[PDB]
Amino acid sequence: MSESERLGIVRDFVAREILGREGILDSLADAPLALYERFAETGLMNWWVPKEHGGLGLGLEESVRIVSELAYGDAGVAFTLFLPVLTTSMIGWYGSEELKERFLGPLVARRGFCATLGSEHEAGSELARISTTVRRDGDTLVLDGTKAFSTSTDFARFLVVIARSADDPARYTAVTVPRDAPGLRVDKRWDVIGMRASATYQVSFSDCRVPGDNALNGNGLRLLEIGLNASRILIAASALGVARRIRDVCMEYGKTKSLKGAPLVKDGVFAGRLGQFEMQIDVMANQCLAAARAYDATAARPDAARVLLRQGAQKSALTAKMFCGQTAWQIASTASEMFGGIGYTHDMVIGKLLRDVRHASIIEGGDDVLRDLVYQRFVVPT
Amino acid sequence: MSESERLGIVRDFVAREILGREGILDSLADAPLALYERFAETGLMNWWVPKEHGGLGLGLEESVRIVSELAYGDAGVAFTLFLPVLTTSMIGWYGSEELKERFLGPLVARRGFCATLGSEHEAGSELARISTTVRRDGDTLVLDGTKAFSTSTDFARFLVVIARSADDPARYTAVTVPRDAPGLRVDKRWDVIGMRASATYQVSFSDCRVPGDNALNGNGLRLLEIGLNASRILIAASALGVARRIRDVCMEYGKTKSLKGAPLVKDGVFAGRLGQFEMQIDVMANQCLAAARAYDATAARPDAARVLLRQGAQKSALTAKMFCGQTAWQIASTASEMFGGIGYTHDMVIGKLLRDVRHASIIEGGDDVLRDLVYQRFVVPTAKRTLEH
Amino acid sequence: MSESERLGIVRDFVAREILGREGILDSLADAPLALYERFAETGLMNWWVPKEHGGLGLGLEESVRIVSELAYGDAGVAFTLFLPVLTTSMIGWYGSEELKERFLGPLVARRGFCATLGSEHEAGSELARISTTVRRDGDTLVLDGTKAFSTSTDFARFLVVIARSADDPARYTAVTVPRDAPGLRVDKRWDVIGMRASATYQVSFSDCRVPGDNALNGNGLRLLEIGLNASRILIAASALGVARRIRDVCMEYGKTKSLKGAPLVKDGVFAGRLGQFEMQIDVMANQCLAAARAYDATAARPDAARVLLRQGAQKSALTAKMFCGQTAWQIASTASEMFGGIGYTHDMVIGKLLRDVRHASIIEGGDDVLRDLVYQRFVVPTAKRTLE
Amino acid sequence: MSESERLGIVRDFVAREILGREGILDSLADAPLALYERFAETGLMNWWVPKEHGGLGLGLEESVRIVSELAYGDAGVAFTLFLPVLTTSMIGWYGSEELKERFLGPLVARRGFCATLGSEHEAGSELARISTTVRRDGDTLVLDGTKAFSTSTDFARFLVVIARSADDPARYTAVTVPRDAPGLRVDKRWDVIGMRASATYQVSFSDCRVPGDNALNGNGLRLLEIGLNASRILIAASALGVARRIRDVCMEYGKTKSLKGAPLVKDGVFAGRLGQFEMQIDVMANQCLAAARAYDATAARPDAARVLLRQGAQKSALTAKMFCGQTAWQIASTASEMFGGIGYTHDMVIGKLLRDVRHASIIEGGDDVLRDLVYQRFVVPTA
Ligand SMILES: Cc1cc2c(cc1C)N(C[C@H](O)[C@H](O)[C@H](O)COP(=O)(O)OP(=O)(O)OC[C@H]1O[C@@H](n3cnc4c(N)ncnc43)[C@H](O)[C@@H]1O)c1[nH]c(=O)[nH]c(=O)c1N2
Ligand SMILES: Cc1cc2c(cc1C)N(C[C@H](O)[C@H](O)[C@H](O)COP(=O)(O)OP(=O)(O)OC[C@H]1O[C@@H](n3cnc4c(N)ncnc43)[C@H](O)[C@@H]1O)c1[nH]c(=O)[nH]c(=O)c1N2
Ligand SMILES: Cc1cc2c(cc1C)N(C[C@H](O)[C@H](O)[C@H](O)COP(=O)(O)OP(=O)(O)OC[C@H]1O[C@@H](n3cnc4c(N)ncnc43)[C@H](O)[C@@H]1O)c1[nH]c(=O)[nH]c(=O)c1N2
Ligand SMILES: Cc1cc2c(cc1C)N(C[C@H](O)[C@H](O)[C@H](O)COP(=O)(O)OP(=O)(O)OC[C@H]1O[C@@H](n3cnc4c(N)ncnc43)[C@H](O)[C@@H]1O)c1[nH]c(=O)[nH]c(=O)c1N2
């Protein structure tokens, strides 16, 4: 199947299961929504997983296009569908071959979800301070602690938990945990203000025991940073998709709205806003594609796992999320006033799109964290 | 009671009835919420209505402070409680003595709401194009048409409707209508994204008959512009109140959030944001008060109704709502990213405050409409006369 | 005469001596320009100095209107003419009666300038770290050190220098120094990017000796903060004046520029920008007037000097300079693109007005300094109190 | 000659002839400055001209890197050196072989400048209203009219003038004119507020006669739009280079400025600003490269001239100039306040860089014009 044919399948899924269903998608309905099963039936679930595990092995450049099309429909749906790339990419590069086969093989075959548990309430983004601990006890690993936010965990097949070693407090380990391990408790689902088609949870571990072979190889904080390269780029692509939707929603309104005796699409102030939007969308698209191409070129190296350990955070993954999160938010903010009073009602979608797009600058590192990281890694040394 | 004790009563009301009860206020609950009757128990309902019409006669300058305090708790509650100033000010200035005694005379003692119906879907802000018509039938006026948005109408005691005459080339008339006039239908309540403690309705008229004496005296679109001077200033005051709440929510979060081994209130980036917020709040407050003082000075003139026909839209009422609506949105927008992931949840109030404060730049004229009005009314005539000219 | 007649005199001065003379004012010519002596002849120099010293004693509210009219013509001319209020207000409240008669009397009668020397290179705005010292030597004070920027000093009658005592753990003192004091050296004039009708200097002291009675009474850094209340409000009023000029320059251009077959003043995008400008000018004006009225109400109190030591920096003086500096810069930035290519030449004044208005957010404390000061003085203590 | 080697030559030229010389560069000195002859001596003048006319034939992608390096030193020097691409690309695609041999050949070998005269005062960007006229007189063309702004004209070898046909008012023609043609008058040099190492002129024509074959083939307004694809992308690349310089000036100041007991490079507000600048520079770079790569792919087609007549303005050329002009101005605006009082003096370069970068959003179409063009061409039709 061609790349163009796959994108048409995604576009038909959006038109068929998302567009016109903003009501249910924005309702924080019992998870998972049936539409996720419908996406499974496309054959495109986990589309990035390598062919060695029965996946399609699609590159991140193609993923940018897929995610932009999904998020045009609903950013919470796109998020839920691409975010497992964070977990699978960490397992792909730093798990043993037997661990990869135990978890990734079934993930693809069963059309399932997985999740990564990094965030904690008190540590915040200062991840050296995380308090979730992992202890060796014979042939098992023992997890204890509370993890603040993780998406899809309740219906995931397995999780990767970033933990600090109690044995050596200077050591951090990523630990694979199956969903129904003893001692794993889903504490609650968060009442998110947007992306309300996604489900995000607080999770607690108390004497949670898993086999010793379940740890990934490497500093868990460095592995997390590497896994976030893919998800940060696709969060940027999601913001691009919402901005495209906002543009199209403005044009649909402008065709029928009258001002000064003509459709609003003929008005100079409106034209100026939409031309600025289109410029911004063009730049966001080129930035996402540049970042994805760089990601794919590195992942194609036969030594990619070792190369990525040296690299850590990819500069253009950080800058793509920063730029697209800021720009799509600014587009939504402008458009939130372009529909008069009806734009202040749920009869128009712009209110939802604005809440949805707000996630991009917040999740996986806010812009204070990421500005500092870009500065320390790519300005100070240069 | 002093002005200071009245504001203490308003603050106590917000503390007792609004703060901590944000869930019900954001729920679009069946209207009117019981808290509006509880506000009437303070003695402050319709606080601006002149002494000559049975009210406390508080000035708009004091109203700015009252609204700011109410909106600090909830902008939709504030909005519901001050918006009738638009209606009562038009009737007080331009209604006949008989009409004023019939509708304004009892309003304060009844603790009643009233509403103004200007907006329409097809006309937009081009109200010269309104399609709600008023036709004369002997000593009676007959209304027909659909009005797009009006706040509190369902539980209001009476309304003022802006209509175009069906008997004249281009004549506009403000017509007073009791809530239960036959022919008046409340079509639906709007599912608003914020201010969900306020209730706003679409309303239709079919052969709705009222006495000819129910028409206010004057060009109805000019009367509406004059009435909007007060509500535009108080919308600005509401945005100021929400901005003060956002500042305080940031400080409360910063006291217990840790960064680099110390509370966030010690961080330089945080301090910079809050110092900027405080500057913007100070500027908003001085603009609202300046606009209100100017309004009060005109309204105290003995010929105020005649003066206001000549003046029309007050420049600083327009610029107050423009500035405060923009600034408070910018503050909420900045603050929406200052709480990390928990700020993306309903565990924090910022998401609600962002939806609430968004109303200020939209309602009673968006900023494209208001920039053009300021330009045409004040910039163009001035440009004739400048030292650079 | 009346306040309106006074403002007409200022407007006439601007129309006759400033407007149309962009080239000379922007040239960093030998200072002071002759137009300053022309202004002296109006009888309005040092218009704020109290009548007890021969001055007109005009309030800061009126000063806002005067300065905005001057700055409409040229922000550097306005700056040069109002900035001595920083120095004279400190001397007026915290100098001895003898010191006030020795310096303020002649300043008015002789139509002179004076300056305040606070800023230093190494200390920056962290003026607790200033390295300019003052040492007692019997009944005389001895000053040593380098001061970074001070306006009009070379042709000023006298200065007030903020110094750190060499005889105390941490004592700061404001010291009056006559221009002809031996040991006072004007190192150089700064080649400023805008306000090139003003002259600002680096100044050094070496064994510069003055009588002990030349010291003002009080913590020198607090006195400075109090003196800056007036000058910060008037910097705000200057930015307001420049914003008014930018609005008017846009309207004059728009009347004769054609677009889509009609004057640009009929265009919707233009109307929106100018409506936004006018909103911002109105808000700036009301902020400046509020700050000035609060300043005037405090200064009218019989115990004003004592009250001001307790109050220090005035919240609305800081917020006025912050707001007007940011807003006038935003207006100039927008306008710098509104004239097409001719706007990128000296045939239009917008390039100069942009450079001129840039001063307002930089001078007398940048916005990083001022946001932090507003935060520490007004946000942190009131967070002890709030309904939430 | 590797590409990295060529870029090293450019960087060495910037270090030798530009850095530390802001005084002279900002002074609107007698033009052309001697440094342009020094650039000619590198062998890189007119580096984009195809090898068919003796040029190096470098693509626009490499040109983006070259211009960014030049503009890092001085945007006005960069502008003067790359802007002839507008003129040469028009002649290359729409001139006859004889015209190309007559004007493009010698341009490369003689290391000269050429210029395009499009803008007019009364027409503004409403170019259908241009009033400069061209009339046929036998086998010759007669030009009459005043052109508002043209860069390097006084020392150019030749010009392309956009004119309206006096015979058929519906027709627009691009006409090549030798600099020394009788009837061509350089009226004045504009006193520009920035890029004061460049020279831009008002030019008038009175009975200016040239051979008929000096005309390019095609609608002159469409040809101008096509030529502007390259120059608009390189204006964006110039703004990028100035933004990189501003970042570096901030870092050099922050290393020696003290704040709360530590160098300013340790301060959180400063780090936030510079991290934001670096993100914006990365995005600008990737947008310029994407636009240049699309330009190069189209220019490499055998039928490029025909393809480009259909295409007209390239979307990503417009969006690159729009984005980079806005972003680099915003960076300059923020930095103009980051140096305290010394930043308000000519002891610091930020004042000049601010004036320099201001050109990018203004020249070759302001953003009101370009937002409307992007809207009409790329938003409205895509139903
Ligand atoms: C819907 C949804 C979905 C998910 C998640 C959250 C949400 C809301 N997350 C967690 C999310 O990625 C996380 O919330 C963000 O990275 C932000 O980190 P914190 O909330 O800890 O705030 P954090 O502590 O980083 O920042 C909070 C505030 O503190 C200030 N601050 C922080 N750093 C600063 C600095 N350097 N300088 C100045 N100020 C600074 C700022 O005001 C900032 O807004 C997650 N997690 C996970 O592990 N797996 C998952 O699947 C998901 N998915
Ligand atoms: C919660 C709530 C409560 C109320 C109301 C609304 C809501 C949402 N209103 C109505 C409200 O005041 C009204 O919606 C606003 O004035 C805006 O008018 P329109 O919705 O018609 O949009 P409008 O047609 O004015 O604008 C829609 C869009 O058109 C564009 N546009 C409009 N004018 C333009 C211009 N000059 N130039 C360029 N673009 C332009 C802009 O994109 C703008 O966003 C009301 N009404 C009433 O009568 N009584 C009441 O009590 C209330 N209360
Ligand atoms: C034309 C002209 C005229 C005058 C003056 C200057 C000029 C240019 N001044 C001096 C002027 O008031 C002084 O330049 C400003 O107050 C700023 O002080 P510094 O230059 O020391 O920079 P300062 O050290 O305050 O700031 C420099 C940079 O450091 C950063 N920074 C500083 N504080 C920060 C913070 N808290 N947080 C984060 N970042 C921070 C910022 O990047 C800022 O731009 C003056 N002086 C005088 O005594 N008498 C006079 O008459 C005049 N008049
Ligand atoms: C240093 C320098 C160098 C050069 C040039 C200029 C300068 C200053 N130019 C000319 C330059 O490209 C030209 O100035 C710009 O394209 C802008 O065109 P106009 O100046 O005619 O203003 P234009 O008329 O396009 O715009 C002026 C103002 O009108 C308003 N406006 C315009 N269009 C609008 C719209 N659609 N909607 C709303 N408002 C609108 C805006 O306020 C705008 O700022 C040139 N020319 C040439 O032929 N050859 C060359 O080499 C050069 N190089």
Q: Does ligand 2 lie within 6 Å of residue A258's CB atom?
A: no
Measure the CA–CA gap between C379 and C372, rounded to whole angstroms.
Answer: 10
The tokens for B116 are 């103004």
The three-class DSSP label of residue D165 is strand
Neighbouring CB atoms inside 10 A of B27's CB total 11
All chains having 3 or more CB pairs closer than 8 angstroms to chain C: A, B, D
Euclidean distance between CA atoms A18 and A14, whole angstroms: 5
* Burial of B59 (C-beta count, 10 Å sphere; 0-12/13-18/19+): middle
Relative orientation angle of helices B220-256 and B268-299, to the nearest 10 degrees: 150
CA distance C125 to C146: 15
User: Ligand 4 centroid vs C281 CA: distance in angstroms?
Assistant: 27
Question: What are C359's two structure tokens?
Answer: 């001063």
- Whether C150 and C117 have beta carbons less than 8 Å apart is answered as yes
- Cα dihedral C333→C335→C336→C337 (10° resolution): 110
**Per residue, what are the HEC states of C193-243?**
CCCCCCCEEEEEEEEEEEEHHHECCCCHHHHHHHHHHHHHHHHHHHHHHHH
How distant is the alpha carbon of residue A381 from its chain centre?
29
Q: Looking at beta carbons, which residues of chain A come within 8 Å of B119?
A: 341
Q: CA dihedral in degrees (A336, A241, C334, C373; nearest 10)?
A: 70
CB B70 within 8 A of CB B241: yes
Residue whose C-alpha is closest to residue C353's, from C237, C189, C238: C238
Beta bridge partners, B185, equal B204
Strand A262-263 to strand B114-117: parallel, antiparallel, or no bridges (unpaired)? unpaired
Q: Could you identify the residue written with the tokens 């306020």?
A: B198
B238 and B75 Cβ atoms separated by less than 8 Å = yes
Structure tokens at B252: 């409360």
Radius of gyration of chain B (CA): 21
Distance, CA of B169 to CA of B157 (rounded, Å): 32
Tokens of A274: 């939409």
C-beta of residue C230 within 8 angstroms of C-beta of residue C85: yes
Q: Which domains does chain A have, with CATH numbers?
A: 1-110 (no CATH), 111-218 (2.40.110.10), 219-382 (no CATH)
Q: With 0-12 CB in 10 A as exposed, 13-18 as middle and 19+ as buried, what is A126?
A: middle
Question: What is the crossing angle of helices C268-299 and C304-311, to 10°?
Answer: 120
- What does the alpha-carbon distance between residue B294 and residue D239 come to, in Å, rounded to a whole number? 47
Alpha carbons D354 and C333: distance in angstroms, whole number: 11
Task: For D285, list phi and psi in degrees, rounded to 5.
Answer: -60, -45
**One-letter amino acid of C134:** V
CB-CB under 8 Å, C379 with B275 = yes
Tokens 């409307």 correspond to D372
Characterize the bridge pairing of strands A140-151 and A114-117.
Answer: unpaired
Q: Which residues from chain B sit within 8 angstroms of residue A345, using beta carbons?
A: 190-193
One-character DSSP codes across D115-155: EEE---TTTTT-GGG---EEEEETTEEEEEEEEEEEETGGG
Q: What is the dihedral of CA A151, A154, A158, A161, to 10 degrees?
A: 60
CA of D230 relative to ligand 4 center, distance in Å: 17
**Whether the Cβ atoms of residue A117 and residue A179 lie closer than 8 Å to each other:** no
Query: Ligand 2: does its nearest atom lie under 6 Å from the Cβ of A344?
Result: yes
Rounded Cα–Cα distance for residues A307 and D115 (Å): 49
Q: Is there a contact between D200 and D116 (Cβ–Cβ < 8 Å)?
A: no
Return the amino acid letter for D31.
Answer: A
Q: Tell me the ligand closest to C350's alpha carbon.
A: 4
Cβ of residue C19 lying under 6 Å from some atom of ligand 4: no
The Cα–Cα gap between C19 and B99 comes to: 57
Q: How far is CA D379 from the centre of its chain?
A: 26
Pairing verdict, β C158-165 and C114-117: parallel
Measured CA to CA, the distance from residue D177 to residue A223 in angstroms comes to: 64
Q: Which of C88, C86, C67, C89 is nearest to C78 (CA)?
A: C67
Experimental method reported for this structure:
X-ray
- How far lies C335's CA from each of B92, B330, C282, C325, C339, in Å? 44, 22, 18, 15, 7
Beta strands D172-178; D262-263: pairing state: unpaired
DSSP 8-state secondary structure symbol assigned to residue A313: S
Name residue D318's amino acid: L
DSSP code of B377? I
| Chain B residues with at least one Cβ partner in A under 8 Å | 119, 121-122, 124-126, 148-149, 190-194, 257-260, 269, 329, 333, 336-337, 340-347, 351, 355, 358-359, 361-363, 366-368
Tell me the sheet residues that pair with C162: C174
Name the DSSP class of A29: P
Closest CA to D89 of D374, D289, D296, D237: D296
- Tokens representing A337? 């006033």
What is the helix (H) or strand (E) element at residue D180, kind and residue range? none
CB contact under 8 A, C376 and B271: yes
Structure tokens at C206: 């070496």
Rounded to the nearest 10 degrees, what angle do helices B268-299 and C315-335 cross at?
90
| Separation CA A37–CA C241 (nearest Å) | 64
Q: What is the CA radius of gyration of chain C?
A: 21
The vertex-C259 CA angle with C258 and C265, nearest 5°, equals 70
CB half-sphere exposure, D81, CA atoms < 13 A = 33
Question: Residue D66 in contact with residue D187, Cβ under 8 Å?
Answer: no
D117 close to D161: Cβ distance less than 8 angstroms: yes
Q: How far is ligand 3, taken at its centre, from the CA of residue A221, in Å? A: 41
* Angstrom distance (rounded) from CA D237 to CA D328: 10
SS (H, E, C) A245-266: HHHHHHHHHHHHCEECCEEHHH
Residue A36 three-state SS: helix
**Which amino acid would we find at residue A325?**
G
Pocket test for ligand 2, best of B83, B114, B120, B125 (most atoms within 8 A of CB): B125
Task: Compute the distance between CA of residue A318 and CA of residue B353 in angstroms, rounded to an integer.
Answer: 29
Which residue from B129, B235, B242, B132 is spatially nearest to B184, judged by alpha carbons?
A: B132
* Paired tokens of C238: 């200057």
Q: Which residues contact A113 (CB under 8 A, 6 or more apart)?
A: A32, A80, A84, A152, A155, A156, A157
Using CA positions, which residue lies closest to atom 21 of ligand 4?
A: D124
Reported in sequence order, the residue ranges of B182-318 that DSSP labels E, i.e. its strands, are 184-189, 200-211, 258-259, 262-263
Closest CA to C331 of C281, C286, C289, C288: C281
**Residue from B247, B256, B264 whose mutation best tests the ligand 1 pocket (most atoms within 8 A of CB):** B264
Strands (E), C290-349: none
Atom of ligand 2 nearest to the CA of B119: 48
Q: Which of C204, C138, C149 is nearest to C177 (CA)?
A: C204
Of B344, B348, B363, B371, which to mutate for an interface test with A (greatest number of A Cβ within 10 Å)?
A: B344
Helical (H) or strand (E) element with A186: strand A184-189
Q: Could you give phi then psi for residue B61, rounded to 5 degrees?
A: -55, -50
DSSP state of D190: -
Residue C234's closest CA among C11, C352, C77, C25?
C77
Element spanning A176, H or E: strand A172-178
On whether the CB atoms of residues A269 and A96 are closer than 8 A, the answer is no
